[PDB]
């Protein structure tokens with residue numbers, strides 16, 4: 001009896017995308033040129049799959065995510081599957097290899113504003129470029145799917161404020177007068193920036209800017 005041997009001890013990474021129902025990954029074969037039962041190789045996933053999401057077809061050697069099962073990067077981002085090939089000799093001989101599965105991200109999580117709504121109070125005489133607020137956000141995705149962009153979508157009368165798209169820092173953009181406009185109800189919007197902007201997700205909320213009185 002000869003042991004069934006795999007070409008490589010590790011093969012990877014194999015890209016599988018989250019949200020994708022039961023996809024094939026790849027075929028994995030052990031070499032074993034014995035006769036009869038000493039060369040009947042059976043395959044199985046023996047470690048690394050704690051939620052039961054994967055299976056290898058016992059004769060063909062095709063690893064897949066199970067039928068009707070979708071992977072999720074936010075619960076598990078990577079898998080190290082131990083594959084076993086065992087013959088039907090006595091004793092049964094066996095070998096194992098490792099398969100790395102990288103779970104590729106989709107944009108399946110909205111950004112969230114962390115510190116809005118907020119009410120800020122500034123001098124009516126605050127000069128252009130003065131600090132108003134620092135808007136903050138998080139996103140559970142990775143890569144471009146969690147890269148966040150800010151902008152003011154409503155209530156920014158006579159272009160009176162500016163927000164840096166990258167940082168989320170709101171500053172004064174024009175001169176202000178309390179006797180013209182005492183209060184600004186700004187709608188600040190944070191969005192992610194996926195490859196395809198048709199699936200971009202957002203969060204909106206109020207930044208209220210109230211001007212304190214001064215001389216004239």
Ligand SMILES: [Ca+2]
Pocket residue numbers: 001002003004032034038039040087089093
């Ligand atoms: Ca064998």
Ligand SMILES: [Ca+2]
Pocket residue numbers: 018072073074108
């Ligand atoms: Ca997910």
Ligand SMILES: [Ca+2]
Pocket residue numbers: 107108109110111139140141145146192201
């Ligand atoms: Ca996202």
Ligand SMILES: [Ca+2]
Pocket residue numbers: 018073074105106107108109140141142145
């Ligand atoms: Ca995701």
Ligand SMILES: [Ca+2]
Pocket residue numbers: 124176177178179214215216
């Ligand atoms: Ca004034």
Ligand SMILES: [Ca+2]
Pocket residue numbers: 178179213214215216
């Ligand atoms: Ca005044």
Ligand SMILES: [K+]
Pocket residue numbers: 112113203204205
């Ligand atoms: K929200």
